[PDB]
């Protein structure tokens, strides 16, 4: 009982490790450096970032979280080892709670667990990302009343209705932050014959992006490739245009919220109408998305406190409930 148990959120962009009794102790990019020819991972996280910055050549920089067995095991080994400052004398390895995407299958869950134990966990358990998000957002997930979370990440939006320590109904769509970026890229290509890159698209979304009602958000000067001449060009784009670019993405997200509500038992949907829907993840920060989802569902919608950290916090808080997740894993044997 001397080694502190761990919760790990291996996110698409950032990895966060929660240590029982200590909180978030590790905040590192979900990045790996591999040897360009032998495809071997030579650094992880901040160490990969530092090595990339020293440009030693013969290295390739990768974001492997969108994982295969050996990459998970290698990344887990690094993060577990780095987060644990001291070991127990009689049991030097932690129990580890691993955040996994919604809809993970049984065989996949056993593979994640195996990779985590290979990485040095005494034993390992999994928790679905929207359930971790609801726990970390402080929703009353253990009570017999309905709670709703909408976790908008990079590659997926997950919607879940929670009650009594479990997901009652849920939906996941592959429409999130990455797809907002792509919609912006495609709108600018079609409207201005201009090809922008990923950095500029993300910057546009962050600086003047919104889900609707973009009054006073402002305009931005952007640079990219004139598709006629192939030379770089600068134009000014408006928050109004960006809002129109993001419309189909936003309403796909709204549709997934509605579709989940439609599959939801009436009394749980009634509870949510009363307490409100909570948005988590980086995509929850899209200006006015809460207002748009609220307007389209006639339900209260709030952005969670600490929306970027909710999943990792909930993965750590799940350590006070290991019996539940123990039982969940034995279901998926």
**If 0-12 CB within 10 Å is exposed, 13-18 middle and 19+ buried, where does residue 114 land?**
middle
Same domain, 56 and 158: no
Give the residue numbers of the binding site for ADP: 12, 154, 202, 205, 282
Q: Are strands 95-100 and 123-128 parallel, antiparallel or unpaired?
A: parallel
Same domain for 226 and 312, yes or no, is no
Q: Are residues 114 and 189 in the same domain?
A: no
How far is residue 135's CA from residue 262's CA, in Å, rounded to a whole number? Answer: 23
Domain-located, residue 332: no
Number of other CB atoms surrounding residue 107 within 10 Å: 8
| Residues that constitute the known binding site for GTP | 12-14, 154, 202, 205, 282
Identify whether residues 111 and 231 lie together within a single domain: no
CA distances from 273 to 84, 98, 147, 225, 295 (A): 42, 31, 9, 47, 12
Last residue of a domain, one of 218, 249, 280: 249
Annotated binding site: 12-14, 154-156, 202-205, 282-285
> Resolution, rounded to a tenth of an Å?
1.8
Helix ranges, the chain (H): 45-53, 69-83, 106-118, 129-136, 177-192, 198-208, 239-245, 247-262, 266-275, 289-297, 310-317, 322-331
Residue 24, CB-side half-sphere exposure with 13 Å CA sphere: 15
Identify the domain containing residue 285 by its residue range.
144-174+250-307
Phi-psi region of 38 (alpha: psi -120 to 50; beta: other; left: phi over 0): alpha
Q: Which residues are annotated as a binding site for ATP?
A: 12-14, 154-156, 202-205, 282-285
Helix axes 69-83, 106-118, angle to 10 degrees: 50
Spatial contact of 27 and 46, defined as CB atoms under 8 Å apart: no
Q: Which residues pair with 302 in a beta bridge?
A: 278
Residue 329 lies in a domain: no
Sign of the four-CA dihedral 172, 29, 18, 304:
negative
CA-derived radius of gyration, the chain = 21
Domain boundary pick from 200, 228, 249: 249
Q: Using what technique was this structure determined? A: X-ray
Rounded Cα–Cα distance for residues 214 and 325 (Å) = 43
Domain count for the chain: 3
Asked whether 124 and 150 are in contact (CB, 8 A), the reply is no
> Is 215 part of a structural domain of the chain?
yes
DSSP one-letter code for 263: T
Q: Are residues 225 and 121 in the same domain?
A: no
Burial class (CB in 10 A: 0-12, 13-18, 19+), 115: buried
Residue 207 lies in a domain: yes
Same domain flag for 191 and 59: no
Q: Are residues 131 and 117 part of one domain?
A: yes
């Amino acid at each position: 009982i001397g080694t502190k148990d761990l919760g790990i959120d291996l996110g698409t962009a950032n990895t966060l490790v929660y240590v029982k009794g200590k909180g978030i102790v590790l905040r590192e990019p979900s990045v790996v450096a591999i040897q360009r020819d032998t495809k071997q991972i030579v650094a992880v996280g901040n160490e990969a970032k530092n090595m990339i910055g020293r440009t030693p050549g013969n290295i390739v920089a990768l974001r492997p979280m969108k994982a295969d067995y050996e990459t998970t095991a290698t990344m887990m080994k690094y993060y577990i080892r780095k987060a644990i400052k001291t070991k127990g004398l009689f049991a030097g390895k932690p129990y580890v709670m691993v955040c996994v995407p919604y809809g993970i299958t049984a065989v996949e869950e056993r593979a994640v667990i195996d990779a985590t134990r290979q990485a040095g966990a005494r034993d390992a358990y999994t928790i679905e990302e929207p359930f971790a998000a609801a726990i970390g957002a402080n929703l009353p997930v253990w009570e017999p009343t309905g709670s709703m979370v909408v976790d908008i990440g990079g590659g997926t939006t997950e919607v879940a209705v929670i009650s009594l320590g479990g997901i009652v109904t849920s939906q996941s769509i592959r429409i999130a932050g990455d797809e907002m970026d792509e919609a912006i890229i495609q709108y600018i290509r079609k409207s201005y014959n201009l090809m922008i890159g990923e950095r500029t698209a993300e910057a546009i979304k962050m600086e003047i992006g919104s889900a609707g009602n973009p009054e006073g958000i402002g305009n931005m000067e952007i640079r990219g490739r004139d598709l006629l001449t192939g030379l770089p060009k600068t134009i000014e784009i408006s928050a109004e245009e960006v809002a129109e670019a993001l419309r189909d993405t936003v309403y796909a997200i709204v549709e997934s919220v509605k579709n989940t509500l439609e599959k939801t038992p009436p009394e749980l949907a009634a509870d949510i109408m009363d307490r409100g829907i909570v948005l988590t993840g980086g995509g929850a920060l899209l200006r006015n998305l809460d207002k748009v989802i609220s307007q389209e569902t006639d339900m209260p919608v709030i952005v969670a406190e600490n929306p970027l950290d909710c999943v990792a916090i909930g993965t750590g808080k799940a350590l006070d409930h290991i019996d539940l997740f123990k039982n969940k894993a034995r279901d998926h044997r």
